[PDB]
Amino acid sequence: MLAKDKVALLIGNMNYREHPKLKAPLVDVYELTNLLRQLDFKVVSLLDLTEYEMRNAVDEFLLLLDKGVYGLLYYAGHGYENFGNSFMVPVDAPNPYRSENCLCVQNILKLMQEKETGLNVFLLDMCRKRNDYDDTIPILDALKVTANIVFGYATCQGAEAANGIFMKFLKDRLLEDKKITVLLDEVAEDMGKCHLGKQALEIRSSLSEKRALTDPIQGTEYESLVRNLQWAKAHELPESMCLKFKCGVQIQLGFAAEFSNVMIIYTKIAYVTDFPLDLDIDPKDANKGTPEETGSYLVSKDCLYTRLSSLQKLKEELVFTVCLSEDKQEVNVGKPLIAKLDMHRH
Amino acid sequence: MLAKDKVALLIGNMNYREHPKLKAPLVDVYELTNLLRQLDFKVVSLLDLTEYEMRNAVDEFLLLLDKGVYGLLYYAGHGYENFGNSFMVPVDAPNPYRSENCLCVQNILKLMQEKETGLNVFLLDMCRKRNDYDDTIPILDALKVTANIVFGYATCQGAEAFELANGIFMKFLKDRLLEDKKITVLLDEVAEDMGKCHLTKGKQALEIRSSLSEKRALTDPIQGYSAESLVRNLQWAKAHELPESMCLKFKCGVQIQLGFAAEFSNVMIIYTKIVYKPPEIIMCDAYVTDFPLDLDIDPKDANKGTPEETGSYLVSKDLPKACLYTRLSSLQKLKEELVFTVCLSYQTVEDKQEVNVGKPLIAKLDM
Numbered sequence A: 001m002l003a004k005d006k007v008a009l010l011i012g013n014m015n016y017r018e019h020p021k022l023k024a025p026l027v028d029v030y031e032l033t034n035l036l037r038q039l040d041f042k043v044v045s046l047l048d049l050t051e052y053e054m055r056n057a058v059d060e061f062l063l064l065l066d067k068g069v070y071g072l073l074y075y076a077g078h079g080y081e082n083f084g085n086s087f088m089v090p091v092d093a094p095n096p097y098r099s100e101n102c103l104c105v106q107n108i109l110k111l112m113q114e115k116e117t118g119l120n121v122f123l124l125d126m127c128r129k130r131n132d133y134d135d136t137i138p139i140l141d142a143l144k145v146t147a148n149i150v151f152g153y154a155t156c157q158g159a160e161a162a163n164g165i166f167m168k169f170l171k172d173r174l175l176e177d178k179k180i181t182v183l184l185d186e187v188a189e190d191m192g193k194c195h196l197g198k199q200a201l202e203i204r205s206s207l208s209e210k211r212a213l214t215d216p217i218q219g220t221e222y223e224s225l226v227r228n229l230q231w232a233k234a235h236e237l238p239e240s241m242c243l244k245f246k247c248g249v250q251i252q253l254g255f256a257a258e259f260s261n262v263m264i265i266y267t268k269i270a271y272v273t274d275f276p277l278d279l280d281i282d283p284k285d286a287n288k289g290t291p292e293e294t295g296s297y298l299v300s301k302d303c304l305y306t307r308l309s310s311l312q313k314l315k316e317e318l319v320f321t322v323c324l325s326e327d328k329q330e331v332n333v334g335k336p337l338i339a340k341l342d343m344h345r346h
Numbered sequence B: 001m002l003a004k005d006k007v008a009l010l011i012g013n014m015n016y017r018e019h020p021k022l023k024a025p026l027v028d029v030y031e032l033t034n035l036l037r038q039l040d041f042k043v044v045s046l047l048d049l050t051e052y053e054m055r056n057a058v059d060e061f062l063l064l065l066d067k068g069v070y071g072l073l074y075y076a077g078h079g080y081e082n083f084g085n086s087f088m089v090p091v092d093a094p095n096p097y098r099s100e101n102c103l104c105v106q107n108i109l110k111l112m113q114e115k116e117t118g119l120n121v122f123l124l125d126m127c128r129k130r131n132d133y134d135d136t137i138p139i140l141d142a143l144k145v146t147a148n149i150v151f152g153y154a155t156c157q158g159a160e161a162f163e164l165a166n167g168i169f170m171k172f173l174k175d176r177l178l179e180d181k182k183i184t185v186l187l188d189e190v191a192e193d194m195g196k197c198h199l200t201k202g203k204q205a206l207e208i209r210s211s212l213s214e215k216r217a218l219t220d221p222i223q224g225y226s227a228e229s230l231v232r233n234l235q236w237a238k239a240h241e242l243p244e245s246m247c248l249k250f251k252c253g254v255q256i257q258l259g260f261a262a263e264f265s266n267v268m269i270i271y272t273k274i275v276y277k278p279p280e281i282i283m284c285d286a287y288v289t290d291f292p293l294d295l296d297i298d299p300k301d302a303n304k305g306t307p308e309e310t311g312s313y314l315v316s317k318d319l320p321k322a323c324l325y326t327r328l329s330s331l332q333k334l335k336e337e338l339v340f341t342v343c344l345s346y347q348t349v350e351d352k353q354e355v356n357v358g359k360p361l362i363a364k365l366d367m
């Protein structure tokens, strides 16, 4: 089987304002991004999105989708299941939350089917208990019989959910040249064999074709020129710049990508300040001697380190100061990584 | 893997008194019974059940499951899916029907677990559209993580299931059922076969829902060696007893052979044959009448020239030829012994003999 393209949207919600915080999404989203990139997927990896942001990320993912394209959604964070429908809880959701505060996976699926995708894969790494505060009754709009829908649930209905358990098992099997349903069924068996017994994968599938995440991508279509120019603008990393001060001191300002919305700034001889107010860069979390202290996935072997984890909140250009203890110098680094696409426009 | 026992309940609803009639459940249940028996399953195949009958049959089938038992439930008939929940429509169901009239699959599931089962397979051959009249949404307690439930839906949610020919689901399922593959792997390959078919495209597609975390197949051998299992083996032995063929001698010298054939666990064929016609008698006819009222037999679906005419799955070549056929479905309704009359008209001279053939097939168990 051939794929028109292979696109993936990975959302990892951890930093909940009015709900318990999560840890596993950081490790699981970074690691799944690496595995999917090895399978030649155009991956968009995003952490901690609000309702407004998640809906804009969904729309940006759909513009990357077309006829015969392989679509994959992976979510890890808070979730619930009511009347057959899966809901993904944004980090700005209140306590309690309703359907309107969250994103329904079936609504995304329907939009993906309207783009005539060749494959739809949903890997839902969340709890599947009911939300007793959600009064809403689904407006039953019968989905199309596309026979290319695969759901991979981390747990069974009404049950609970270093890597998280689901990613721990998924990692060891994801690269295999096997039909996605056969591969997920093997992952479910791996969990069954493991002594550490209580949690179980649930697979829902209407897939009628032998489609695998390993399938090769067909030759370039000659609107497809629109899709690939939008993509090549998604992961632009600022060029390492050398700074000159009036005292003769020279500092090298460097950048590294952690996620589509997460970039590490590192100064080598010197601290960074006056970042945009939309970015919510707490100066107590900036300029760490180690990248682990900043909350990064990146360890020291991957000077001073600062993590900008909310690039999706950037409306204008990334302009900030580089202070040397007294002198200051402004730097304009443009719109880095996913800030370059105006996702806010949706 | 190993099974302590392999048990299956097959329900085929067609003759609804308040809803359009169906055709495919007759051939599909018959054909699935054969294949499942070939996989050493104890099978109970029931045609046209009422709410009372369906609830009872399912209650008992849940009981039959013990630790490590392989249980398969198959339904073919009218169905619906409201807000995640699937419902099976009995033949006596009113117009319109509600959940309180139908059997919820999400309920049956919960009661299979409480019996510590080894594999639970649910094959639902029905439409999954919503019922606008069901102004009630059941909310069931957290699905117990037994990690051994496999659901095979003929079609997708909000879509329809399409069709002596098989329905689309059985047409593809019968070709693979006997393969030595994990039930999830097997169902997935049938989904692929359905996909290759010109007729199905954009209309019907099998949907599989599985939580099976072990290499379990319908081809797994039976092991386990229990007192309770012997009771079920004793009860199931009684269940499919067919009356032995009898010869009735009349006053005029005409001998008539009365024969029986099992069609389903609750469906029996009765046939009459003139075995001896004295040269003197040229034109003679034998016919069956005065059957128990519990059975509800149309006398215009009795004493037919061909078995096909009685509404049977069995063709003229599937039984002894040059006879008269009477089909008795509704054996689950028979409370007393099966007593009827055998009439003989010969050129017109009439005579009769009363016949008692005990409690045939499912009627041998009190229900």
Ligand SMILES: FC(F)(F)c1nccc(N[C@H]2CC[C@@H](Nc3ccc4nnc(Cl)n4n3)CC2)n1
Residues within 6 Å of the ligand: B006, B007, B008, B009, B042, B043, B044, B046, B049, B052, B053, B054, B056, B057, B058, B060, B061, B064, B231, B232, B233, B235, B236, B239, B266, B332, B362, B365, B367
């Ligand atoms: F006919 C109805 F009206 F539907 C009706 N009314 C009432 C009950 C009923 N029970 C049904 C038919 C008999 C079956 N008894 C067995 C026994 C052992 C065993 N071992 N393997 C298998 Cl299989 N069985 N089945 C259980 C289901 N049916």
